[PDB]
Amino acid sequence: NYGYQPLFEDRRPRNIGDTLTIVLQENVSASKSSSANASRDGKTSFGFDTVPRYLQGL
Amino acid sequence: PTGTNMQLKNVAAVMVTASYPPFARQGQTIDVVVSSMGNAKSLRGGTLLMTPLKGVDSQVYALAQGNILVGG
């Protein structure tokens, strides 16, 4: 004797020892990315190629 | 077989409702109401197969099976 068994209810595990099918379908995909940058360029110049006479002391 | 086409015409899926009377004891009988649930034309002379009547707590308090009486 197996006890009350339903007639229209789906066949589910109910007690200890009942078997159940597991469809293993795992798909995990995690990602991360990052970046940082900095730049700085400078040029300076001053040339008195021909100095006038009133400014040759400076 | 899982993959097959069944196209029935003499079977209807129904919901059965009843009242659990005060001080009801196991073995007594109660009246039930049978109502069709999907696209069924009639339930004229059908027979209700073994149906467990659950409570709010989802526990079986009655078992239903009999011949339906439709006015006509």
mmCIF file with all atom_site columns, all heavy atoms in Angstrom, chain B residues 1-25:
data_model
loop_
_atom_site.group_PDB
_atom_site.id
_atom_site.type_symbol
_atom_site.label_atom_id
_atom_site.label_alt_id
_atom_site.label_comp_id
_atom_site.label_asym_id
_atom_site.label_entity_id
_atom_site.label_seq_id
_atom_site.pdbx_PDB_ins_code
_atom_site.Cartn_x
_atom_site.Cartn_y
_atom_site.Cartn_z
_atom_site.occupancy
_atom_site.B_iso_or_equiv
_atom_site.pdbx_formal_charge
_atom_site.auth_seq_id
_atom_site.auth_comp_id
_atom_site.auth_asym_id
_atom_site.auth_atom_id
_atom_site.pdbx_PDB_model_num
ATOM 1   N N   . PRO B 1 1  ? 2.820   8.601  -25.036 1.00 0.00 ? 1  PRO B N   1
ATOM 2   C CA  . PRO B 1 1  ? 4.055   9.306  -25.401 1.00 0.00 ? 1  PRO B CA  1
ATOM 3   C C   . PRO B 1 1  ? 3.916   10.815 -25.257 1.00 0.00 ? 1  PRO B C   1
ATOM 4   O O   . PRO B 1 1  ? 2.850   11.386 -25.490 1.00 0.00 ? 1  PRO B O   1
ATOM 5   C CB  . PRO B 1 1  ? 4.268   8.902  -26.863 1.00 0.00 ? 1  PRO B CB  1
ATOM 6   C CG  . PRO B 1 1  ? 3.613   7.584  -26.975 1.00 0.00 ? 1  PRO B CG  1
ATOM 7   C CD  . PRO B 1 1  ? 2.418   7.635  -26.071 1.00 0.00 ? 1  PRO B CD  1
ATOM 8   N N   . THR B 1 2  ? 5.015   11.452 -24.847 1.00 0.00 ? 2  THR B N   1
ATOM 9   C CA  . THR B 1 2  ? 5.003   12.892 -24.612 1.00 0.00 ? 2  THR B CA  1
ATOM 10  C C   . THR B 1 2  ? 4.691   13.654 -25.892 1.00 0.00 ? 2  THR B C   1
ATOM 11  O O   . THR B 1 2  ? 3.887   14.596 -25.889 1.00 0.00 ? 2  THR B O   1
ATOM 12  C CB  . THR B 1 2  ? 6.345   13.340 -24.039 1.00 0.00 ? 2  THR B CB  1
ATOM 13  O OG1 . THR B 1 2  ? 7.338   13.300 -25.071 1.00 0.00 ? 2  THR B OG1 1
ATOM 14  C CG2 . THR B 1 2  ? 6.770   12.419 -22.908 1.00 0.00 ? 2  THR B CG2 1
ATOM 15  N N   . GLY B 1 3  ? 5.315   13.265 -26.998 1.00 0.00 ? 3  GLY B N   1
ATOM 16  C CA  . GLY B 1 3  ? 5.022   13.907 -28.261 1.00 0.00 ? 3  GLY B CA  1
ATOM 17  C C   . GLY B 1 3  ? 3.913   13.201 -29.008 1.00 0.00 ? 3  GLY B C   1
ATOM 18  O O   . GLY B 1 3  ? 4.151   12.217 -29.713 1.00 0.00 ? 3  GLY B O   1
ATOM 19  N N   . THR B 1 4  ? 2.693   13.710 -28.866 1.00 0.00 ? 4  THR B N   1
ATOM 20  C CA  . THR B 1 4  ? 1.534   13.132 -29.528 1.00 0.00 ? 4  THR B CA  1
ATOM 21  C C   . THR B 1 4  ? 0.407   14.151 -29.488 1.00 0.00 ? 4  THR B C   1
ATOM 22  O O   . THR B 1 4  ? 0.414   15.079 -28.674 1.00 0.00 ? 4  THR B O   1
ATOM 23  C CB  . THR B 1 4  ? 1.099   11.816 -28.873 1.00 0.00 ? 4  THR B CB  1
ATOM 24  O OG1 . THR B 1 4  ? 0.237   11.101 -29.764 1.00 0.00 ? 4  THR B OG1 1
ATOM 25  C CG2 . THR B 1 4  ? 0.357   12.085 -27.574 1.00 0.00 ? 4  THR B CG2 1
ATOM 26  N N   . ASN B 1 5  ? -0.554  13.977 -30.387 1.00 0.00 ? 5  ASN B N   1
ATOM 27  C CA  . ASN B 1 5  ? -1.710  14.861 -30.481 1.00 0.00 ? 5  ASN B CA  1
ATOM 28  C C   . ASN B 1 5  ? -2.945  14.101 -30.016 1.00 0.00 ? 5  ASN B C   1
ATOM 29  O O   . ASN B 1 5  ? -3.365  13.135 -30.661 1.00 0.00 ? 5  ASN B O   1
ATOM 30  C CB  . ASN B 1 5  ? -1.884  15.380 -31.906 1.00 0.00 ? 5  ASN B CB  1
ATOM 31  C CG  . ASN B 1 5  ? -1.763  14.285 -32.942 1.00 0.00 ? 5  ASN B CG  1
ATOM 32  O OD1 . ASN B 1 5  ? -0.995  13.338 -32.772 1.00 0.00 ? 5  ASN B OD1 1
ATOM 33  N ND2 . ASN B 1 5  ? -2.524  14.405 -34.022 1.00 0.00 ? 5  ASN B ND2 1
ATOM 34  N N   . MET B 1 6  ? -3.517  14.532 -28.897 1.00 0.00 ? 6  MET B N   1
ATOM 35  C CA  . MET B 1 6  ? -4.795  14.028 -28.416 1.00 0.00 ? 6  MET B CA  1
ATOM 36  C C   . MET B 1 6  ? -5.834  15.118 -28.611 1.00 0.00 ? 6  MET B C   1
ATOM 37  O O   . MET B 1 6  ? -5.680  16.227 -28.089 1.00 0.00 ? 6  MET B O   1
ATOM 38  C CB  . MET B 1 6  ? -4.722  13.619 -26.947 1.00 0.00 ? 6  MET B CB  1
ATOM 39  C CG  . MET B 1 6  ? -3.776  12.479 -26.655 1.00 0.00 ? 6  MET B CG  1
ATOM 40  S SD  . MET B 1 6  ? -4.115  11.749 -25.047 1.00 0.00 ? 6  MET B SD  1
ATOM 41  C CE  . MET B 1 6  ? -4.355  13.221 -24.063 1.00 0.00 ? 6  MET B CE  1
ATOM 42  N N   . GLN B 1 7  ? -6.887  14.806 -29.356 1.00 0.00 ? 7  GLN B N   1
ATOM 43  C CA  . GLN B 1 7  ? -7.960  15.751 -29.639 1.00 0.00 ? 7  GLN B CA  1
ATOM 44  C C   . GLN B 1 7  ? -9.257  15.110 -29.160 1.00 0.00 ? 7  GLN B C   1
ATOM 45  O O   . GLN B 1 7  ? -9.948  14.427 -29.918 1.00 0.00 ? 7  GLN B O   1
ATOM 46  C CB  . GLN B 1 7  ? -7.999  16.096 -31.119 1.00 0.00 ? 7  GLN B CB  1
ATOM 47  C CG  . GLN B 1 7  ? -8.722  17.390 -31.436 1.00 0.00 ? 7  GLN B CG  1
ATOM 48  C CD  . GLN B 1 7  ? -8.212  18.035 -32.705 1.00 0.00 ? 7  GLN B CD  1
ATOM 49  O OE1 . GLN B 1 7  ? -8.945  18.738 -33.399 1.00 0.00 ? 7  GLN B OE1 1
ATOM 50  N NE2 . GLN B 1 7  ? -6.942  17.803 -33.013 1.00 0.00 ? 7  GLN B NE2 1
ATOM 51  N N   . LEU B 1 8  ? -9.578  15.330 -27.890 1.00 0.00 ? 8  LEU B N   1
ATOM 52  C CA  . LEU B 1 8  ? -10.739 14.716 -27.273 1.00 0.00 ? 8  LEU B CA  1
ATOM 53  C C   . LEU B 1 8  ? -11.987 15.554 -27.521 1.00 0.00 ? 8  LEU B C   1
ATOM 54  O O   . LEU B 1 8  ? -11.924 16.743 -27.836 1.00 0.00 ? 8  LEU B O   1
ATOM 55  C CB  . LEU B 1 8  ? -10.515 14.546 -25.774 1.00 0.00 ? 8  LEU B CB  1
ATOM 56  C CG  . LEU B 1 8  ? -9.149  14.012 -25.357 1.00 0.00 ? 8  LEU B CG  1
ATOM 57  C CD1 . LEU B 1 8  ? -8.935  14.261 -23.884 1.00 0.00 ? 8  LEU B CD1 1
ATOM 58  C CD2 . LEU B 1 8  ? -9.029  12.537 -25.673 1.00 0.00 ? 8  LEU B CD2 1
ATOM 59  N N   . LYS B 1 9  ? -13.143 14.911 -27.368 1.00 0.00 ? 9  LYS B N   1
ATOM 60  C CA  . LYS B 1 9  ? -14.418 15.604 -27.479 1.00 0.00 ? 9  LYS B CA  1
ATOM 61  C C   . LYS B 1 9  ? -15.394 15.262 -26.366 1.00 0.00 ? 9  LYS B C   1
ATOM 62  O O   . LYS B 1 9  ? -16.396 15.968 -26.224 1.00 0.00 ? 9  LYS B O   1
ATOM 63  C CB  . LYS B 1 9  ? -15.083 15.305 -28.831 1.00 0.00 ? 9  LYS B CB  1
ATOM 64  C CG  . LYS B 1 9  ? -14.289 15.759 -30.042 1.00 0.00 ? 9  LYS B CG  1
ATOM 65  C CD  . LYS B 1 9  ? -15.198 16.043 -31.227 1.00 0.00 ? 9  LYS B CD  1
ATOM 66  C CE  . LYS B 1 9  ? -15.946 14.801 -31.680 1.00 0.00 ? 9  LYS B CE  1
ATOM 67  N NZ  . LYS B 1 9  ? -15.077 13.870 -32.448 1.00 0.00 ? 9  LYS B NZ  1
ATOM 68  N N   . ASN B 1 10 ? -15.146 14.222 -25.573 1.00 0.00 ? 10 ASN B N   1
ATOM 69  C CA  . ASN B 1 10 ? -16.059 13.795 -24.525 1.00 0.00 ? 10 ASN B CA  1
ATOM 70  C C   . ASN B 1 10 ? -15.537 14.102 -23.129 1.00 0.00 ? 10 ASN B C   1
ATOM 71  O O   . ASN B 1 10 ? -16.098 13.605 -22.150 1.00 0.00 ? 10 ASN B O   1
ATOM 72  C CB  . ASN B 1 10 ? -16.339 12.297 -24.645 1.00 0.00 ? 10 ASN B CB  1
ATOM 73  C CG  . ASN B 1 10 ? -16.718 11.887 -26.046 1.00 0.00 ? 10 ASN B CG  1
ATOM 74  O OD1 . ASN B 1 10 ? -16.187 10.918 -26.582 1.00 0.00 ? 10 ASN B OD1 1
ATOM 75  N ND2 . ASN B 1 10 ? -17.638 12.619 -26.647 1.00 0.00 ? 10 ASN B ND2 1
ATOM 76  N N   . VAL B 1 11 ? -14.488 14.908 -23.011 1.00 0.00 ? 11 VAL B N   1
ATOM 77  C CA  . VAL B 1 11 ? -13.844 15.189 -21.734 1.00 0.00 ? 11 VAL B CA  1
ATOM 78  C C   . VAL B 1 11 ? -13.818 16.695 -21.526 1.00 0.00 ? 11 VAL B C   1
ATOM 79  O O   . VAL B 1 11 ? -13.485 17.447 -22.447 1.00 0.00 ? 11 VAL B O   1
ATOM 80  C CB  . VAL B 1 11 ? -12.419 14.607 -21.682 1.00 0.00 ? 11 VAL B CB  1
ATOM 81  C CG1 . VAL B 1 11 ? -11.742 14.975 -20.377 1.00 0.00 ? 11 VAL B CG1 1
ATOM 82  C CG2 . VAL B 1 11 ? -12.459 13.106 -21.846 1.00 0.00 ? 11 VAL B CG2 1
ATOM 83  N N   . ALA B 1 12 ? -14.188 17.132 -20.324 1.00 0.00 ? 12 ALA B N   1
ATOM 84  C CA  . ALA B 1 12 ? -14.148 18.540 -19.961 1.00 0.00 ? 12 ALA B CA  1
ATOM 85  C C   . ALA B 1 12 ? -13.443 18.716 -18.626 1.00 0.00 ? 12 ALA B C   1
ATOM 86  O O   . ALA B 1 12 ? -13.663 17.945 -17.693 1.00 0.00 ? 12 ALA B O   1
ATOM 87  C CB  . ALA B 1 12 ? -15.554 19.136 -19.880 1.00 0.00 ? 12 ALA B CB  1
ATOM 88  N N   . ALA B 1 13 ? -12.601 19.740 -18.529 1.00 0.00 ? 13 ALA B N   1
ATOM 89  C CA  . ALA B 1 13 ? -11.946 20.079 -17.275 1.00 0.00 ? 13 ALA B CA  1
ATOM 90  C C   . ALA B 1 13 ? -12.854 21.006 -16.483 1.00 0.00 ? 13 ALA B C   1
ATOM 91  O O   . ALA B 1 13 ? -13.295 22.036 -17.000 1.00 0.00 ? 13 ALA B O   1
ATOM 92  C CB  . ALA B 1 13 ? -10.595 20.745 -17.526 1.00 0.00 ? 13 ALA B CB  1
ATOM 93  N N   . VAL B 1 14 ? -13.140 20.637 -15.231 1.00 0.00 ? 14 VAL B N   1
ATOM 94  C CA  . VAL B 1 14 ? -14.131 21.340 -14.431 1.00 0.00 ? 14 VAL B CA  1
ATOM 95  C C   . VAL B 1 14 ? -13.558 21.662 -13.058 1.00 0.00 ? 14 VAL B C   1
ATOM 96  O O   . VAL B 1 14 ? -12.613 21.028 -12.584 1.00 0.00 ? 14 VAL B O   1
ATOM 97  C CB  . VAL B 1 14 ? -15.431 20.526 -14.274 1.00 0.00 ? 14 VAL B CB  1
ATOM 98  C CG1 . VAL B 1 14 ? -16.031 20.212 -15.625 1.00 0.00 ? 14 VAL B CG1 1
ATOM 99  C CG2 . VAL B 1 14 ? -15.152 19.254 -13.503 1.00 0.00 ? 14 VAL B CG2 1
ATOM 100 N N   . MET B 1 15 ? -14.165 22.655 -12.418 1.00 0.00 ? 15 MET B N   1
ATOM 101 C CA  . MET B 1 15 ? -13.893 22.999 -11.031 1.00 0.00 ? 15 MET B CA  1
ATOM 102 C C   . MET B 1 15 ? -15.096 22.601 -10.191 1.00 0.00 ? 15 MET B C   1
ATOM 103 O O   . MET B 1 15 ? -16.241 22.887 -10.560 1.00 0.00 ? 15 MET B O   1
ATOM 104 C CB  . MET B 1 15 ? -13.607 24.492 -10.870 1.00 0.00 ? 15 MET B CB  1
ATOM 105 C CG  . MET B 1 15 ? -12.360 24.975 -11.583 1.00 0.00 ? 15 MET B CG  1
ATOM 106 S SD  . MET B 1 15 ? -10.815 24.343 -10.911 1.00 0.00 ? 15 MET B SD  1
ATOM 107 C CE  . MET B 1 15 ? -10.898 24.980 -9.247  1.00 0.00 ? 15 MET B CE  1
ATOM 108 N N   . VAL B 1 16 ? -14.835 21.929 -9.077  1.00 0.00 ? 16 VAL B N   1
ATOM 109 C CA  . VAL B 1 16 ? -15.868 21.433 -8.180  1.00 0.00 ? 16 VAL B CA  1
ATOM 110 C C   . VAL B 1 16 ? -15.798 22.235 -6.890  1.00 0.00 ? 16 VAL B C   1
ATOM 111 O O   . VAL B 1 16 ? -14.716 22.405 -6.315  1.00 0.00 ? 16 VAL B O   1
ATOM 112 C CB  . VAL B 1 16 ? -15.697 19.930 -7.907  1.00 0.00 ? 16 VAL B CB  1
ATOM 113 C CG1 . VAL B 1 16 ? -16.866 19.402 -7.121  1.00 0.00 ? 16 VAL B CG1 1
ATOM 114 C CG2 . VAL B 1 16 ? -15.556 19.181 -9.211  1.00 0.00 ? 16 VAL B CG2 1
ATOM 115 N N   . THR B 1 17 ? -16.945 22.738 -6.447  1.00 0.00 ? 17 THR B N   1
ATOM 116 C CA  . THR B 1 17 ? -17.042 23.525 -5.227  1.00 0.00 ? 17 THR B CA  1
ATOM 117 C C   . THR B 1 17 ? -18.060 22.890 -4.293  1.00 0.00 ? 17 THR B C   1
ATOM 118 O O   . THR B 1 17 ? -19.090 22.381 -4.736  1.00 0.00 ? 17 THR B O   1
ATOM 119 C CB  . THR B 1 17 ? -17.441 24.973 -5.522  1.00 0.00 ? 17 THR B CB  1
ATOM 120 O OG1 . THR B 1 17 ? -18.548 24.991 -6.432  1.00 0.00 ? 17 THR B OG1 1
ATOM 121 C CG2 . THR B 1 17 ? -16.278 25.736 -6.127  1.00 0.00 ? 17 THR B CG2 1
ATOM 122 N N   . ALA B 1 18 ? -17.772 22.923 -2.997  1.00 0.00 ? 18 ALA B N   1
ATOM 123 C CA  . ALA B 1 18 ? -18.674 22.336 -2.021  1.00 0.00 ? 18 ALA B CA  1
ATOM 124 C C   . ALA B 1 18 ? -18.563 23.098 -0.712  1.00 0.00 ? 18 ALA B C   1
ATOM 125 O O   . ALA B 1 18 ? -17.671 23.926 -0.522  1.00 0.00 ? 18 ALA B O   1
ATOM 126 C CB  . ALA B 1 18 ? -18.378 20.851 -1.806  1.00 0.00 ? 18 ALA B CB  1
ATOM 127 N N   . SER B 1 19 ? -19.476 22.794 0.203   1.00 0.00 ? 19 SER B N   1
ATOM 128 C CA  . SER B 1 19 ? -19.470 23.370 1.538   1.00 0.00 ? 19 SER B CA  1
ATOM 129 C C   . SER B 1 19 ? -19.175 22.269 2.542   1.00 0.00 ? 19 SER B C   1
ATOM 130 O O   . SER B 1 19 ? -19.832 21.226 2.539   1.00 0.00 ? 19 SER B O   1
ATOM 131 C CB  . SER B 1 19 ? -20.807 24.037 1.866   1.00 0.00 ? 19 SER B CB  1
ATOM 132 O OG  . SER B 1 19 ? -21.099 25.072 0.946   1.00 0.00 ? 19 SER B OG  1
ATOM 133 N N   . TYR B 1 20 ? -18.189 22.507 3.389   1.00 0.00 ? 20 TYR B N   1
ATOM 134 C CA  . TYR B 1 20 ? -17.882 21.596 4.477   1.00 0.00 ? 20 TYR B CA  1
ATOM 135 C C   . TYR B 1 20 ? -18.806 21.911 5.645   1.00 0.00 ? 20 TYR B C   1
ATOM 136 O O   . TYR B 1 20 ? -18.689 22.987 6.242   1.00 0.00 ? 20 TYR B O   1
ATOM 137 C CB  . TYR B 1 20 ? -16.423 21.751 4.887   1.00 0.00 ? 20 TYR B CB  1
ATOM 138 C CG  . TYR B 1 20 ? -15.904 20.662 5.785   1.00 0.00 ? 20 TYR B CG  1
ATOM 139 C CD1 . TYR B 1 20 ? -15.559 19.426 5.272   1.00 0.00 ? 20 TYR B CD1 1
ATOM 140 C CD2 . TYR B 1 20 ? -15.738 20.874 7.143   1.00 0.00 ? 20 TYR B CD2 1
ATOM 141 C CE1 . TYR B 1 20 ? -15.079 18.432 6.084   1.00 0.00 ? 20 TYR B CE1 1
ATOM 142 C CE2 . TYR B 1 20 ? -15.256 19.884 7.964   1.00 0.00 ? 20 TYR B CE2 1
ATOM 143 C CZ  . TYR B 1 20 ? -14.929 18.664 7.428   1.00 0.00 ? 20 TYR B CZ  1
ATOM 144 O OH  . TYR B 1 20 ? -14.449 17.666 8.237   1.00 0.00 ? 20 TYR B OH  1
ATOM 145 N N   . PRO B 1 21 ? -19.729 21.019 5.996   1.00 0.00 ? 21 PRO B N   1
ATOM 146 C CA  . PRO B 1 21 ? -20.762 21.357 6.973   1.00 0.00 ? 21 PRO B CA  1
ATOM 147 C C   . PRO B 1 21 ? -20.213 21.330 8.388   1.00 0.00 ? 21 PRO B C   1
ATOM 148 O O   . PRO B 1 21 ? -19.150 20.745 8.641   1.00 0.00 ? 21 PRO B O   1
ATOM 149 C CB  . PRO B 1 21 ? -21.814 20.257 6.766   1.00 0.00 ? 21 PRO B CB  1
ATOM 150 C CG  . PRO B 1 21 ? -21.462 19.607 5.467   1.00 0.00 ? 21 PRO B CG  1
ATOM 151 C CD  . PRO B 1 21 ? -19.984 19.717 5.370   1.00 0.00 ? 21 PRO B CD  1
ATOM 152 N N   . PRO B 1 22 ? -20.908 21.958 9.335   1.00 0.00 ? 22 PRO B N   1
ATOM 153 C CA  . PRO B 1 22 ? -20.457 21.908 10.729  1.00 0.00 ? 22 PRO B CA  1
ATOM 154 C C   . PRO B 1 22 ? -20.463 20.486 11.263  1.00 0.00 ? 22 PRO B C   1
ATOM 155 O O   . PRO B 1 22 ? -21.345 19.687 10.945  1.00 0.00 ? 22 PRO B O   1
ATOM 156 C CB  . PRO B 1 22 ? -21.477 22.784 11.461  1.00 0.00 ? 22 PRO B CB  1
ATOM 157 C CG  . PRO B 1 22 ? -22.060 23.651 10.407  1.00 0.00 ? 22 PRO B CG  1
ATOM 158 C CD  . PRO B 1 22 ? -22.081 22.828 9.167   1.00 0.00 ? 22 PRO B CD  1
ATOM 159 N N   . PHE B 1 23 ? -19.457 20.178 12.084  1.00 0.00 ? 23 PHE B N   1
ATOM 160 C CA  . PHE B 1 23 ? -19.345 18.885 12.759  1.00 0.00 ? 23 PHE B CA  1
ATOM 161 C C   . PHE B 1 23 ? -19.393 17.728 11.766  1.00 0.00 ? 23 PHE B C   1
ATOM 162 O O   . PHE B 1 23 ? -19.946 16.666 12.051  1.00 0.00 ? 23 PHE B O   1
ATOM 163 C CB  . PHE B 1 23 ? -20.432 18.720 13.820  1.00 0.00 ? 23 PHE B CB  1
ATOM 164 C CG  . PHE B 1 23 ? -20.485 19.843 14.807  1.00 0.00 ? 23 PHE B CG  1
ATOM 165 C CD1 . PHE B 1 23 ? -21.645 20.570 14.979  1.00 0.00 ? 23 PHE B CD1 1
ATOM 166 C CD2 . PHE B 1 23 ? -19.380 20.161 15.571  1.00 0.00 ? 23 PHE B CD2 1
ATOM 167 C CE1 . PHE B 1 23 ? -21.698 21.596 15.890  1.00 0.00 ? 23 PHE B CE1 1
ATOM 168 C CE2 . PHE B 1 23 ? -19.427 21.189 16.479  1.00 0.00 ? 23 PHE B CE2 1
ATOM 169 C CZ  . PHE B 1 23 ? -20.587 21.906 16.640  1.00 0.00 ? 23 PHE B CZ  1
ATOM 170 N N   . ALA B 1 24 ? -18.810 17.933 10.590  1.00 0.00 ? 24 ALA B N   1
ATOM 171 C CA  . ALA B 1 24 ? -18.797 16.882 9.588   1.00 0.00 ? 24 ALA B CA  1
ATOM 172 C C   . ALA B 1 24 ? -17.880 15.754 10.033  1.00 0.00 ? 24 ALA B C   1
ATOM 173 O O   . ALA B 1 24 ? -16.784 15.987 10.549  1.00 0.00 ? 24 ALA B O   1
ATOM 174 C CB  . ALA B 1 24 ? -18.342 17.432 8.239   1.00 0.00 ? 24 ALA B CB  1
ATOM 175 N N   . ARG B 1 25 ? -18.335 14.524 9.835   1.00 0.00 ? 25 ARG B N   1
ATOM 176 C CA  . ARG B 1 25 ? -17.576 13.341 10.193  1.00 0.00 ? 25 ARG B CA  1
ATOM 177 C C   . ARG B 1 25 ? -17.233 12.569 8.930   1.00 0.00 ? 25 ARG B C   1
ATOM 178 O O   . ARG B 1 25 ? -17.989 12.581 7.956   1.00 0.00 ? 25 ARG B O   1
ATOM 179 C CB  . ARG B 1 25 ? -18.357 12.449 11.155  1.00 0.00 ? 25 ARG B CB  1
ATOM 180 C CG  . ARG B 1 25 ? -19.168 13.217 12.175  1.00 0.00 ? 25 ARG B CG  1
ATOM 181 C CD  . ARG B 1 25 ? -19.259 12.461 13.479  1.00 0.00 ? 25 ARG B CD  1
ATOM 182 N NE  . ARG B 1 25 ? -17.964 12.371 14.137  1.00 0.00 ? 25 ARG B NE  1
ATOM 183 C CZ  . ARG B 1 25 ? -17.474 13.301 14.944  1.00 0.00 ? 25 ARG B CZ  1
ATOM 184 N NH1 . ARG B 1 25 ? -18.145 14.408 15.209  1.00 0.00 ? 25 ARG B NH1 1
ATOM 185 N NH2 . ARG B 1 25 ? -16.280 13.114 15.500  1.00 0.00 ? 25 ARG B NH2 1
#
